[PDB]
Write a protein that binds this ligand. Sequence first.
Ligand SMILES: [Mg+2]
Ligand SMILES: [Zn+2]
Ligand SMILES: [Zn+2]
Lengths: 99, 79, 1337
Amino acid sequence: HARSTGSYSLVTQQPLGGKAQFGGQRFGEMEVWALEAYGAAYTLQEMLTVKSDDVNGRTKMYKNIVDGNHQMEPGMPESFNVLLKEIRSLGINIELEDE
Amino acid sequence: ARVTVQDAVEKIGNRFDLVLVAARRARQMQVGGKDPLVPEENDKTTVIALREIEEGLINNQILDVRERQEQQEQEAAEL
Amino acid sequence: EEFDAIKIALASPDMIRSWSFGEVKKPETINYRTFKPERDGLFCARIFGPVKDYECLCGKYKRLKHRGVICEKCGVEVTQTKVRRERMGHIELASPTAHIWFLKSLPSRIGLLLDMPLRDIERVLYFESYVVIEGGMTNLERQQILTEEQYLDALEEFGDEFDAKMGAEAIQALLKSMDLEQECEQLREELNETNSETKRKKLTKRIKLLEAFVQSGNKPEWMILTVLPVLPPDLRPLVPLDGGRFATSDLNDLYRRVINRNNRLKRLLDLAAPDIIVRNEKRMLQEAVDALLDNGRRGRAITGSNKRPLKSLADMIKGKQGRFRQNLLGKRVDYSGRSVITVGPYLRLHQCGLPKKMALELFKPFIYGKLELRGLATTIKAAKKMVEREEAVVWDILDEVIREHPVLLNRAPTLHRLGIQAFEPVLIEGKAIQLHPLVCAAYNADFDGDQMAVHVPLTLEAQLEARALMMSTNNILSPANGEPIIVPSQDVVLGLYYMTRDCVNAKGEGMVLTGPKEAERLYRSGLASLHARVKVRITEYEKDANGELVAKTSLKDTTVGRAILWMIVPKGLPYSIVNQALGKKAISKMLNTCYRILGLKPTVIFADQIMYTGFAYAARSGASVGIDDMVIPEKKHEIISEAEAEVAEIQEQFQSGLVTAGERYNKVIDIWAAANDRVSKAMMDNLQTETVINRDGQEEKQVSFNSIYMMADSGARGSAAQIRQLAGMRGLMAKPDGSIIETPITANFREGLNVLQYFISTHGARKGLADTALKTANSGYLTRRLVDVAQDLVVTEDDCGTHEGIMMTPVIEGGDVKEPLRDRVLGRVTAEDVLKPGTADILVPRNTLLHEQWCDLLEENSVDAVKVRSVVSCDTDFGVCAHCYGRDLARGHIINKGEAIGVIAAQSIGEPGTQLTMSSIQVKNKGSIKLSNVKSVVNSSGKLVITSRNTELKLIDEFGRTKESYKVPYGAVLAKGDGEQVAGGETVANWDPHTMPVITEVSGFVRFTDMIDGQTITRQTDELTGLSSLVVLDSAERTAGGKDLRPALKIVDAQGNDVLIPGTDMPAQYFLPGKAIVQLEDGVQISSGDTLARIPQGLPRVADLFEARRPKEPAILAEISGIVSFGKETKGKRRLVITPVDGSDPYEEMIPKWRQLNVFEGERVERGDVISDGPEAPHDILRLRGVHAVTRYIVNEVQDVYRLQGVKINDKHIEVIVRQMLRKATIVNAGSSDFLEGEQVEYSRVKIANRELEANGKVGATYSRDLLGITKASLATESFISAASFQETTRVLTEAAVAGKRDELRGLKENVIVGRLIPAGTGYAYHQDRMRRRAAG
RNA sequence: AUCGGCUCA
DNA sequence: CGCCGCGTCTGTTGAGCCGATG
DNA sequence: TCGAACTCAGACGCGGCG
Ligand SMILES: [Mg+2]
Ligand SMILES: [Zn+2]
Ligand SMILES: [Zn+2]
């Protein structure tokens, strides 16, 4: 099985799973520890934002790849702000300070 | 540096600063439009940057000096 | 957009109205027939947003001209539909309700504030009783709950001077009424009075909470809700089905129930219905809300249609399925694939295979770019079709793109950092990912159906990282311990072992050659045999000079196979590397020596050539196994017949009653074991050397060529025990209980075995299978807890500048060598200068990296204790330095700042856990006997006996290093004298393994005073001999008349005074403890060395040390040195009047005396000395001894459990975990912070280095030190995202919410959540540049 | 989307 | 101070398949 | 709203009672 771009979920905006519906593999927390031990820090920034959740990031990344320039503009994994709204729905004022 | 990246490490000092320096140089070749120094031999920009670092031509201060010169001279020639 | 820190508080009703966009009133969702959102329902388009981009609902205005124009007839703003994800709503409750988390969580945070018990608050809020708010009449008091009955009597007795009511409104009234200043000050002032532990602890907790509310800025009354919020639609969709059915999350259901209850209660409230209807309706509203917050807490969970509980909000964050673990730390990822692996041996170890079409699907956009650049396709659609139709130019372009573009291969589970590596593709046709052979030991992969996953790196930095950090040829030393990780595995070694061996007759015997090349020609033409002894001429290079090579030639005496090998050894190695028969230990040494001398690149080339030639010359021999190879020894009938005769005789003797029950059992198993051993030895004496072959004469014997023996000798597969299974007896088998069954198996796997012999093997087989499948659970769990504790630590500063650390000595003790000094010192850095027995030879500028040469020099001398710099002492705040850690095991030099240290340590300590759950003192070697700090005396016979536990017998070599060490009990007999050379094999210490003597080192009379039998003792005269002594009864039998009098002999002189201890004025009269029954009676002396009285007698270990768990037999220690004393007796347990020499006594509690003690009533001790016996609790060690004591205890114990099974990890990885347990302290004195609150220790050391500087003399506080288990030191940390991410999410989140903390974004997890660059490794420099800019403005 | 059941390393 | 009893909270990781229900 | 649920188990901290 092999995937380069396909469907996406609905409530959390990251790719589906399993061959039956043409999904991408899973990068579980054990691999994240493996990739922190080496010292690589750009690689899992890549695997956390512009290949999974950052919407503007992924569209502009595809643009750059097909355009011949290999670069990256990251944002915020939007399932994080899903988490913000689930917490601040309970009556707790989670909200992130500014500069 | 096609196989092993041992020499450049001693030539700069860290497995990490080498990554940043080589990435910056390969960027300059990728889009900035400069020309390489060591002959191509049908090889990607990344290994070209690694070979330049190994031979002893593209350090960090050399990058700073060279960009400063090009900036000043083009600005002065603007008028 | 950018930010710096994140913050929690409590949310006040004005805030809730500030978030919201419009009230929700009616619970209809959508019309089930027309698919439109109902107005004022849980999906209304008026409140939240449009349904399609730039269109209203009725459909009047459209698409750009009316931007923002709120249409008037349907009432929906004209903007994007990515606003259904962001706008919120709210319900206005008719009556207040109570938040669960701030009520039913542990200590309630309401019951702690008001201070009244929990049960009262439930029974008020369940609508069961009333409560009095404020009585103007002073006969009643606030908060005194009143049931309805006495509520009546109160109603008529006074009536109006009191306020009493029921429900959440009452709790609002109480929570409004009180202040936060005056109670704080009253408790603060009156706390100082009586330090009862209960009072102290309670008042500290109360003060801390009240001060938190005052300081943070919150207000208590906000705990109970009066406006609920509603989260947007797309966060809780309603998905269509095939057939008009709708599947919706449970949230919509939970909201409908509350909406309906609210509307109906409002109705009943308007018309002033009679009281009971209002009561029930309000209680049902309460239940609906606090079932929405989290389902199964207050009562029983409200199930859905299917008898399954519903899914609240508070369980869309918990568990293994919530956000923090299922969806935010591990994403799904695209640009990836997976498949089935298989071998290919034509590769080079920086390559792998890709099937054509997997690589044509992963690298798609690169292909589009190349095509459009070449000009073959004008637009994107042309490229789509040209790629799908698969025209040959696509194959040419694809071969262009993947060149020089590494990919990442991964295999799950990924136990340690060698689990994913970066290879470089080679395109093949097929369906399976080929893979090199040598790198299957690192992955732990076999080729019988495994699967493997492939990712690609996109950008330009990540590609250089996959080339320079994690390629396959860059890491060839494991970071647990610097042992190479490319050992040649199982088939190449047999080829290397079949080439280099010698037969005695073959052909070309004894002719001479001119080089390896003519040896190749001769073997290939068929004029000589592959192994037939010869003498050749060879040319070998040594580089002993100043770094350059020199050549020397000679005639060597070797076979033909070795002269073929010498063609690949790379010009720096001596020829004696090859002259031997190369089992796999020799191959591994060969590779290691190449690595030491010539560097890296020759090692890679050489390892690959070894693989190729091993394969090629192992296939060329043909090496099969056939039923003629399993060779049964000839002398096997006799052995078993003799054993059966012997067991029959023992059975006969038993049936005649001469011998007992168990004795027969033991003798039978012994004789069967002996028969087993000699059968096995006969077998192996027949296999190994029995080929008898003749040449140039009569006969000779050589080692064999039996296929089983070559596969077992060289080291490819198998061992001696398993050949014994196949040919000799297969031993005795054990039954499930654990016992050993009596009659053993007798047949093997060549003769076939019987029925019930098979049915007995099944027991052990299933026990093994069942264990292997139920380790992995808690092994994985332990790895997770370790990685989560050691997470943060990174190497920050260069040199900490601290002073002395810990001291290292060998641990060969007990038996022979366990660990030399070498393996406990390679890598560390010396904490000071180590003097030498040849003095004035100082070796350091106080600190040098002890690499191999220095350990060698230190070996040539005779030093046996060094002091090294350990990471438990380094001072640098928030990290360590680059010298305390020492050598980087993988790279081979000093560690460079920026590594991650916690994660490496936790992975490398939790990875071997899969293999894990599976009298007399004799001198053994000649050497001097040395005893230091020892009290001893020459016995009456003339030999030595000891009167000091402090020293134990150290057997010392002629040089000074301790050869051996033994622990010997008190007063036992010795057969030698101190400080003399003693012959080996000698009983140098002797005592009955039950008997403890009460010898008198002093000389004089022993006379009976203080003891009167029946009071402390009884007269028990030995009826066998006639002489005995007044028997010191045990504490149980000794009566209460003399219970309070210590049974005490008076060691006297001829005059009557107490015998003083020699050299001191301390009287020495034995206050005998129990079982110290003297043998020698009144009027009889006990001189030096004479016995007065004889006193006869897996994985959870590791997961329980690292937990700071407490055992249940606390070996009490000595709190302060000096003489001791006892006191009052047996009120449950006795008391322990400690007797400081110049200090104060009264410290004492109960005593466990139910086990045999050590100290006497009148003995002088040093602090930290045992009293009763048993294991220890580490907290005690930390309290009484320092921090080095506890580190050395932990490291030696865990290292013991590991080393029992031949698993070696280095020692640093134990020390860093401990250094993440001791980071919390409690204060005893005061001066800026509170009295005894727990406190991060780094902040205390920051303060003390500030105020007790020139500014103030002495106000900085004194602090004890504290220890915590890993599952509890992880939770109580500074940041509330690093603690709410794995366990206890609701408790942690609530106690952070009340006190208004703020996270600071410093760890590594805290940054992989929000999507920034890790502060470790490559992402370091920039990440501290950010911090520099945080400070200049 | 949830639940139950069988299977692979 | 010291038993003695009570309600929370934990328990490996990737994949493959098919019924059930709404 | 009757209808089950069962013998997980190991550890820790709190509310009562002496
Ligand atoms: Mg396997
Ligand atoms: Zn409209
Ligand atoms: Zn240090």
